[PDB]
């Protein structure tokens, strides 16, 4: 339900290769993605469960 759940994954200006999850509303599920290590947005979990419990079915 939250609506940040509908935003596309945000990498950030930092330069790391960090694997994260983000809910993909088109698909209907959380998927993995690479995060830069800073300035994270809300649709960005450390785990699919989290990602699923929070944006689930959004």
């Amino acid at each position: 339900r939250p609506d940040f759940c509908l935003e596309p994954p945000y990498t950030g200006p930092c330069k790391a290769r960090i694997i994260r999850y983000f809910y993909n509303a088109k698909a209907g599920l959380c998927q993995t993605f690479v995060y830069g290590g800073c300035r994270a947005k809300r649709n960005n979990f450390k785990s699919a469960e989290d990602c699923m419990r929070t944006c689930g079915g959004a």
């Binding site: 200006p13 930092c14 790391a16 290769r17 960090i18 694997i19 830069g36 290590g37 800073c38 300035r39």
Partner: protein, 131 residues
Amino acid sequence: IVNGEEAVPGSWPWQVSLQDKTGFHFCGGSLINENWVVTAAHCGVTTSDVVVAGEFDQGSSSEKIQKLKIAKVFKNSKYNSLTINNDITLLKLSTAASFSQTVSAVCLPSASDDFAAGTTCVTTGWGLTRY
């Protein structure tokens, strides 16, 4: 590194690779002596990650490198998550690095050292080549 050139094996001996359990590389680091690694704060290193010294070719069934364990992590207390200021961390090694010919430490500057603009420096890593 975008637009870089492939380096000569063992020429940047201080350079390590921080990886996860599965062996996934997510950040670089530098050796400052046999027990300490200097890296970025936002890399989010943790005691369960690994330091890997000795490499050059990450795609090698097996080479002659060292996998060290993280004794302890120290993010600098002043690191600003929002501004990105003071982005530094020290990793203390569980097991010291055996310095070799491919494994050395880098020199640390002095607080008053002055580095002139226009000077040529170098940077190395295993980061994307293309965006």
